[PDB]
């Protein structure tokens, strides 16, 4: 019970830690979209 | 044991985050070092 | 002060010399006869390797030891272990939901690492 | 893998937005004897095996099997008075010494709580210094990038 609860805890903490990677990465990808489109227009 | 495991995984991912940003900084330095030469060649024609 | 097999408070505690963990004598003697090794650290251990007062105030209303106390002991043994089997089945289902969403998030980062750096590279190529 | 926790000061809407991205990927990928048999059946049914309360039930002017029942009541009362006589001789003293044993056991648990609390703070304390250093390296990288983007347009 306790040995997989360590596997449950280490996964769920790392899942939300890896989830924060996407929130950072999606916002930077979005900034590179509007930067290039306003530049390539002009 | 969580923060013991959280310390070990994040300390290896920090170097990979920086070295990705380090190599991205070297490529932007090449565009800056080259664009100034074309402006430096403007006074050569003058 | 407790036993490291059952969760008892031992009456004749014995300690092992390969890993110092205090066990009740009957439980540690049973393990070495089953598989001759220390239960915690899985190291070689025998019965001769082991190295050898608690008061419980009986209740004033101590028939009940035959009827009422003995039924409650085998009720609490039966309900707890069944609830513990229900606890072990649910976490192995929740282990599967943990790793699948973890591998789902890995494919996000693997997809988005190709998206971000090429979007930044196209900004560097845009200057030329 | 590298997600800054202490550094990133991440809204709840970003947690909902990132979870939808994870959920969209989730949609794509899509030893005993017979005592164990009795204990599992009794817990699944939730029913307990009945004990004998016949000794409370016995009544006067009844048959030979109930004559065995009333003599059973006499042996139980003599045992109950003997068991009560030991407790009286012992006094509370015996209940007192077991209470002192419980306070010593309870104190050992509280010390294990401080040991784990001290260590989990130390793991966080090491992580906090790494996050602040990873902040300045990322911030200097962003400042150098914003210089290069502005300079390349200015040269051209």
Summarize the structure.
Chain B is mostly helical and about 45 residues long. In chain B, about 95% of the residues lie in helices and about 0% in strands. Chain D has one domain (about 10-155).
- Termini distance of chain A? 62 Å
> Secondary-structure element order of chain D, as H and E?
HHHH
Run of helices and strands of chain A: H
Q: Provide the β-strand percentage band of chain D.
A: under 5%
* Total DSSP helices of chain D: 4
In whole angstroms, how far apart are the ends of chain D?
38 Å
Largest interface: C-D, 33 and 37 residues
Question: Which structural category fits the helices and strands of chain D?
Answer: mainly alpha
Protein name (chain D): Pre-mRNA-splicing factor SNT309
Subunit structure (chain D): Belongs to the NTC complex (or PRP19-associated complex), composed of at least CEF1, CLF1, ISY1, NTC20, SNT309, SYF1, SYF2, and PRP19.
Keywords (chain D): mRNA processing, mRNA splicing, Nucleus, Spliceosome
Subcellular location (chain D): Nucleus
Q: What do you see in this structure?
A:
The structure is cut from a larger assembly and holds 2 copies of chain A, 1 copy of chain B (about 45 residues) and 1 copy of chain D (about 160 residues). Chain A is built from 1 helix and no strands. Chain A is mainly α and about 40 residues long. Chain A is rod-shaped. Chain B has about 45 residues and is an all-alpha fold. Helices cover about 95% and strands about 0% of the residues of chain B. Chain B is built from 2 helices and no strands. Chain B is rod-shaped, with a radius of gyration of 21 Å. Chain D has one domain. Chain D starts with 11 loop residues before the first helix and ends with a helix. The chains are: A mainly alpha (about 40), B mainly alpha (about 45), D mainly alpha (about 160). The interface of C and D includes residues 57 and 77 of C. The PDB classes it as splicing.
